[PDB]
Amino acid sequence: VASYDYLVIGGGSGGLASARRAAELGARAAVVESHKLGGTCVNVGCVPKKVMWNTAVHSEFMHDHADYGFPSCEGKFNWRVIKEKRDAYVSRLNAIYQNNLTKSHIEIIRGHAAFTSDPKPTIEVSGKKYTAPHILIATGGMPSTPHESQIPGASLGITSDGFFQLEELPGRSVIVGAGYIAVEMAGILSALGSKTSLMIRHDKVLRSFDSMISTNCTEELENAGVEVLKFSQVKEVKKTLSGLEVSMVTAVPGRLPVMTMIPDVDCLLWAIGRVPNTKDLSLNKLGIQTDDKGHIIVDEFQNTNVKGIYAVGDVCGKALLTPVAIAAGRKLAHRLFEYKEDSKLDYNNIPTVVFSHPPIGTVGLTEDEAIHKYGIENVKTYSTSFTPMYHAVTKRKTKCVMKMVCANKEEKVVGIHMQGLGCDEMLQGFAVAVKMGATKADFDNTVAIHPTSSEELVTLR
Amino acid sequence: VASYDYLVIGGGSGGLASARRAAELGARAAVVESHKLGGTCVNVGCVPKKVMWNTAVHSEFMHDHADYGFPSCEGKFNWRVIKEKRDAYVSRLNAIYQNNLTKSHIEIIRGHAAFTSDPKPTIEVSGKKYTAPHILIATGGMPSTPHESQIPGASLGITSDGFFQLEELPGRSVIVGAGYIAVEMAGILSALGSKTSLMIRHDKVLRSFDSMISTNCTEELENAGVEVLKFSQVKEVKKTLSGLEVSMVTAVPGRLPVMTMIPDVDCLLWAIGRVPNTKDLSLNKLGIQTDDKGHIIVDEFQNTNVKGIYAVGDVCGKALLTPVAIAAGRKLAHRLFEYKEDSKLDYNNIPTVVFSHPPIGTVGLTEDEAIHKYGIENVKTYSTSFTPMYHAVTKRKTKCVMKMVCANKEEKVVGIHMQGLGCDEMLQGFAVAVKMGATKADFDNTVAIHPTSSEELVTLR
Numbered sequence: 021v022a023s024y025d026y027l028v029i030g031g032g033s034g035g036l037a038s039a040r041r042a043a044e045l046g047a048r049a050a051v052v053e054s055h056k057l058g059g060t061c062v063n064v065g066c067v068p069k070k071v072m073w074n075t076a077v078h079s080e081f082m083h084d085h086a087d088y089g090f091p092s093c094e095g096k097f098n099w100r101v102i103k104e105k106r107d108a109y110v111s112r113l114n115a116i117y118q119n120n121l122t123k124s125h126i127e128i129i130r131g132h133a134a135f136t137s138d139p140k141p142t143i144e145v146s147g148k149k150y151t152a153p154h155i156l157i158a159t160g161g162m163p164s165t166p167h168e169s170q171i172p173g174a175s176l177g178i179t180s181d182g183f184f185q186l187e188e189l190p191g192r193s194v195i196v197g198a199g200y201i202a203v204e205m206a207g208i209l210s211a212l213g214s215k216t217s218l219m220i221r222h223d224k225v226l227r228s229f230d231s232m233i234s235t236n237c238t239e240e241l242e243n244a245g246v247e248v249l250k251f252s253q254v255k256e257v258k259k260t261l262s263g264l265e266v267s268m269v270t271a272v273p274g275r276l277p278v279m280t281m282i283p284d285v286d287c288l289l290w291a292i293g294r295v296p297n298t299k300d301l302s303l304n305k306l307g308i309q310t311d312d313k314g315h316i317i318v319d320e321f322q323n324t325n326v327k328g329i330y331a332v333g334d335v336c337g338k339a340l341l342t343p344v345a346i347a348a349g350r351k352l353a354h355r356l357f358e359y360k361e362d363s364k365l366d367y368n369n370i371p372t373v374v375f376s377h378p379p380i381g382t383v384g385l386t387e388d389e390a391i392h393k394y395g396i397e398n399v400k401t402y403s404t405s406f407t408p409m410y411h412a413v414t415k416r417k418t419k420c421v422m423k424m425v426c427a428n429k430e431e432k433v434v435g436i437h438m439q440g441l442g443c444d445e446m447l448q449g450f451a452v453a454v455k456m457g458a459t460k461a462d463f464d465n466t467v468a469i470h471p472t473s474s475e476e477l478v479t480l481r
Numbered sequence: 482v483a484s485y486d487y488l489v490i491g492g493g494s495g496g497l498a499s500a501r502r503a504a505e506l507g508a509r510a511a512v513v514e515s516h517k518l519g520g521t522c523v524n525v526g527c528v529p530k531k532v533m534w535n536t537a538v539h540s541e542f543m544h545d546h547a548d549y550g551f552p553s554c555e556g557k558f559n560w561r562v563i564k565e566k567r568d569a570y571v572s573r574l575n576a577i578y579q580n581n582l583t584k585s586h587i588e589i590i591r592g593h594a595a596f597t598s599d600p601k602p603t604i605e606v607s608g609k610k611y612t613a614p615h616i617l618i619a620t621g622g623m624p625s626t627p628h629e630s631q632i633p634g635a636s637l638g639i640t641s642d643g644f645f646q647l648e649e650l651p652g653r654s655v656i657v658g659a660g661y662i663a664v665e666m667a668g669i670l671s672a673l674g675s676k677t678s679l680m681i682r683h684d685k686v687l688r689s690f691d692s693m694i695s696t697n698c699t700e701e702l703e704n705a706g707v708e709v710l711k712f713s714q715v716k717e718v719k720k721t722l723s724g725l726e727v728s729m730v731t732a733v734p735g736r737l738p739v740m741t742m743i744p745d746v747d748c749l750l751w752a753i754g755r756v757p758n759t760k761d762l763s764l765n766k767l768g769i770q771t772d773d774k775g776h777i778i779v780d781e782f783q784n785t786n787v788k789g790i791y792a793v794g795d796v797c798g799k800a801l802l803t804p805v806a807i808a809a810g811r812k813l814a815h816r817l818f819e820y821k822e823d824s825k826l827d828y829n830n831i832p833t834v835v836f837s838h839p840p841i842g843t844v845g846l847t848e849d850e851a852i853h854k855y856g857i858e859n860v861k862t863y864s865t866s867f868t869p870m871y872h873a874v875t876k877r878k879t880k881c882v883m884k885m886v887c888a889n890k891e892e893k894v895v896g897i898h899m900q901g902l903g904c905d906e907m908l909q910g911f912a913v914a915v916k917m918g919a920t921k922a923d924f925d926n927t928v929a930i931h932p933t934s935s936e937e938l939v940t941l942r
């Protein structure tokens with residue numbers, strides 16, 4: 021039984037960040053990883069995603085070429101070119117991560133970990149046992165797929181994982197889901213030339229975003245050539261002579277349900293949710309609490325119900341983002357190895373960027389949420405809508421929408437919501453301001469940067 | 482003698498903003514304007530500049546086309562196309578501004594104003610007299626040109642004004658100056674295909690920026706194809722059979738001076754400074770104080786030395802930016818018409834973006850300035866340099882450099898300096914944070930947005 025100061029199960033965003041910081045603090049740590057370092061973000065997430073988005077972005081900017089004085093650019097996108105390059109880039113990161121572990125003196129135990137029956141918390145990986153007085157579960161999640169029992173042929177469609185394995189651009193594609201992944205994927209497939217549909221169960225996407233964003237986002241999708249099938253759901257999938265045929269039920273409220281076949285589908289992509297990867301851990305041998313989705317339950321300090329067993333990131337099922345796993349794994353190393361008992365992540369005011377076209381940035385409360393927290397009489401919002409100066413000379417147009425939610429008399433800024441060109445890079449510092457508790461006077465007393473999009477947030481009236 | 486509550490001399494950024502706010506407060510105001518509303522920014526500045534930069538930006542992104550999966554884009558930029566469109570856009574703004582005045586009930590007195598000999602401060606425009614108990618001088622500045630007496634043939638070159646009148650793309654161009662305008666113009670001419678030189682009297686551009694920025698900026702210029710002639714200056718200009726021929730002295734220190742002829746120059750562009758437009762105001766009839774450059778002297782509240790005569794913006798010669806004229810003209814309307822005696826602009830922490838390639842964002846103190854204000858032992862800086870993920874798959878590369886200057890133990894952030902893709906839109910909110918007095922813990926406690934460039938500012942170590 022080899023013993024360590026800290027054993028980390030999962031070599032992804034959270035596990036790596038935690039192990040690394042712990043090691044700086046003097047801990048003798050090991051990372052168990054059964055697949056590739058970097059975990060979801062690097063391999064099939066954030067990274068290969070952003071590369072594909074920058075690719076889609078080139079496709080749209082190239083539509084503006086002629087408007088800008090140049091001669092029309094003519095053609096066909098070549099998927100394999102960028103795919104090979106994207107893959108290589110991911111290979112490059114994997115080796116950097118591996119080296120990071122090494123320089124830190126972190127041991128890497130390769131293989132699939134599971135808890136044992138043993139009294140003191142202990143895992144087994146490939147017949148060997150390992151133990152530590154602090155064990156971190158950071159095994160993340162996976163794409164959820166439907167059961168053939170509820171939707172026959174569900175297994176003919178792919179997930180975001182499968183999207184990263186594609187070798188050619190699908191001629192016809194149908195995406196099911198209304199979350200950010202769904203949105204992002206529909207936007208990349210479309211810009212790249214796939215004839216794309218987004219199948220959503222209601223009337224808008226991103227329904228948990230401020231309603232200014234779900235509305236604006238649904239429109240921009242449509243304007244960009246994406247067909248959003250509202251109130252629709254898949255009833256069955258079948259392999260036809262040439263692709264797939266998707267049977268769907270459309271149930272607009274106040275209308276009779278209607279069934280439609282969607283034929284000649286090259287790509288059916290499920291973007292319906294994520295499930296926690298806890299199934300094969302043998303948790304129950306220690307009685308670790310999970311919820312009914314298989315999520316590990318933790319407290320504000322990332323503790324599980326069992327002493328010296330913690331969990332961070334996706335597995336815990338809250339705020340499914342890479343920087344949140346990182347921040348939580350980092351605060352936890354300080355708490356365990358630097359004895360900072362108050363060290364924990366504040367889950368409020370986490371900012372998100374959705375890589376749509378135009379991208380989306382959001383931090384803090386939606387208008388509704390502020391209304392529920394402070395009361396209608398104590399919530400005031402400010403907003404603006406304009407056409408970015410980039411489009412002053414184009415025929416193609418996009419819009420920029422910004423919304424600021426304030427609370428109480430002081431007009432404390434509790435929420436910033438926007439969509440528009442540049443909004444991916446504009447977010448970070450307002451998110452700092454929002455964390456510090458700024459009010460609207462603070463924003464207003466900041467001299468504007470002209471001409472930009474970002475100056476609109478500081479000149480709202 | 483028509484009387485008003487507020488007479489504004491100048492219909493540019495500062496004069497318009499001041500007149501408008503004053504009118505909301507109940508004042509009966511008139512704007513005197515001898516040219517076009519919008520003043521320098523709209524007509525020959527910020528606006529036509531940004532349009533041309535977005536144009537240059539298309540030129541560079543089009544170099545990356547093939548790397549991204551697409552087929553090479555082949556060609557020739559057409560200057561007249563974009564120029565016509567740019568002009569129309571400016572026409573569009575002029576009419577909006579005019580309408581803004583109108584809806585506000587601001588009277589527009591068209592023509593050139595000058596003070597009179599009269600005891601109570603009074604101006605004359607086209608034989609008629611006008612007066613008010615509060616008069617705002619906001620007549621801005623103009624491009625400085627050399628005297629034929631010091632540099633013979635100086636008059637064969639043009640200024641930034643003339644740049645906006647050009648109808649074709651100059652085949653060979655030489656820019657003189659090392660300030661932001663100079664930089665911006667060299668970057669636009671170059672990207673658009675002009676064979677461009679930047680003639681600077683020292684070894685770096687933007688010498689008043691943090692030294693990380695002047696160095697990085699000089700390099701990026703070179704890497705982008707701009708020839709920076711260091712320690713050089715123009716000795717004479719002459720009209721040859723085919724263009725201009727520029728005689729220059731190059732005086733590298735520790736070396737003998739060397740004289741060079743630069744032949745076949747299509748465009749010689751002076752970007753050497755700006756002079757205040759006060760010459761034709763008859764100031765001296767009221768004894769209004771100016772400095773020896775013709776700048777109007779004011780105090781922290783924008784007062785001149787004469788009661789009920791104020792000055793804002795470029796004419797005053799400090800912080801030559803559109804949003805500063807605006808903020809000062811606005812604070813002044815509140816002070817005069819809303820009786821807020823403490824209403825004035827804080828000139829610290831004004832942020833700037835330089836529209837270079839990649840753009841530059843800066844707010845607060847340079848490393849040197851913090852060193853002088855707090856002492857070497859109390860200044861700590863943090864910085865990073867990396868290749869933005871956009872270039873992971875290109876052959877062409879640019880870099881991103883960020884620097885954070887902190888002071889005292891608390892590590893108060895007194896300065897942020899960066900250069901890189903996205904840096905034009907990233908600045909605004911950090912500038913809010915810097916205005917609020919944030920420290921580095923504040924930045925550090927903000928959850929990062931991944932994958933972006935902006936997340937680097939919040940993960941500095």
Ligand SMILES: Cc1cc2nc3c(=O)[nH]c(=O)nc-3n(C[C@H](O)[C@H](O)[C@H](O)COP(=O)(O)OP(=O)(O)OC[C@H]3O[C@@H](n4cnc5c(N)ncnc54)[C@H](O)[C@@H]3O)c2cc1C
Nearest residue numbers: 030032033034054059060065133159160333334340341342
């Ligand atoms: C398509 C897509 C795009 C995304 N885009 C972004 C984005 O742009 N920005 C962002 O912030 N987030 C994004 N996310 C979310 C982000 O990827 C996740 O929040 C993040 O990866 C969660 O990290 P984690 O540390 O919990 O686990 P993961 O990163 O999933 O790592 C868990 C690791 O555990 C290993 N493992 C699991 N079980 C075991 C076991 N029993 N033994 C050993 N090893 C094991 C797995 O192989 C894996 O490497 C995206 C996600 C997806 C799917």
Ligand SMILES: Cc1cc2nc3c(=O)[nH]c(=O)nc-3n(C[C@H](O)[C@H](O)[C@H](O)COP(=O)(O)OP(=O)(O)OC[C@H]3O[C@@H](n4cnc5c(N)ncnc54)[C@H](O)[C@@H]3O)c2cc1C
Nearest residue numbers: 491493494495515520521526594620621794795801802803
């Ligand atoms: C090439 C260039 C690019 C620039 N880019 C930017 C940028 O991107 N961002 C930025 O923030 N700043 C930029 N600037 C700076 C910005 O344009 C100036 O700071 C700003 O215009 C100053 O405004 P102002 O109100 O003092 O005067 P101005 O805007 O110059 O207006 C003064 C007005 O007074 C009128 N006038 C003058 N004398 C009289 C008189 N006697 N009677 C009647 N009318 C009179 C003039 O016609 C004019 O319209 C740029 C400047 C230039 C030259």
Ligand SMILES: N[C@@H](CCNC(=O)[C@@H](CSSC[C@@H](NC(=O)CC(=O)O)C(=O)NCC[C@H](N)C(=O)O)NC(=O)CC(=O)O)C(=O)O
Nearest residue numbers: 405406407408409471472473475476479522523528574807
């Ligand atoms: N800052 C933005 C665009 C800002 N403005 C617009 O698109 C104007 C079209 S023209 S209004 C002047 C626009 N600016 C210029 O060209 C101005 C300039 O040269 O300063 C503008 O509103 N600029 C920003 C001023 C700032 N928001 C303030 O209040 O200080 N319409 C709206 O804001 C919607 C509305 O309120 O009707 C950008 O650079 O893309």
Ligand SMILES: N[C@@H](CCNC(=O)[C@@H](CSSC[C@@H](NC(=O)CC(=O)O)C(=O)NCC[C@H](N)C(=O)O)NC(=O)CC(=O)O)C(=O)O
Nearest residue numbers: 061062067113346866867868869870932933934936937940
């Ligand atoms: N955030 C930037 C790029 C960031 N990183 C780099 O270019 C890495 C090349 S790889 S290091 C991992 C780079 N990221 C990923 O691909 C990571 C991911 O998938 O999270 C990275 O450093 N990401 C940001 C993590 C963050 N800055 C933190 O400290 O939390 N080199 C440096 O930062 C320079 C150095 O310190 O040697 C972007 O998205 O362009």
